[PDB]
């Protein structure tokens, strides 16, 4: 993928015990977020902001990972 440029592959939350960026398990309170960017899932404190993603003409929820890829490619 392009980030942005078309949907990934989203992670199943089935196939996802932990945050994909900094490693916590996921819990009751402890629950999970993907990145429209990279379709990984993420713990909230590592996927909180939005930007615009092309795929989807509009802001949607982005890892740190991709916010920072994509907000200086924009
Ligand atoms: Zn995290
Ligand atoms: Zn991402």
Redesign the pocket.
């Given at each position: 993928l392009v980030l942005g440029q078309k949907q990934p592959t989203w992670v199943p939350d089935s196939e996802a015990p932990n945050?994909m960026?900094?490693?916590?398990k996921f819990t009751f309170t402890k629950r999970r977020h993907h990145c429209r960017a990279c379709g990984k899932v993420?713990?909230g404190?590592?996927?909180n902001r939005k930007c615009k993603l092309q795929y989807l003409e509009k802001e949607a929820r982005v890892c740190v990972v991709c916010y920072e890829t994509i907000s200086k490619a924009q």
């Open positions: 945050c960026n900094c490693q916590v993420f713990c404190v590592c996927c």
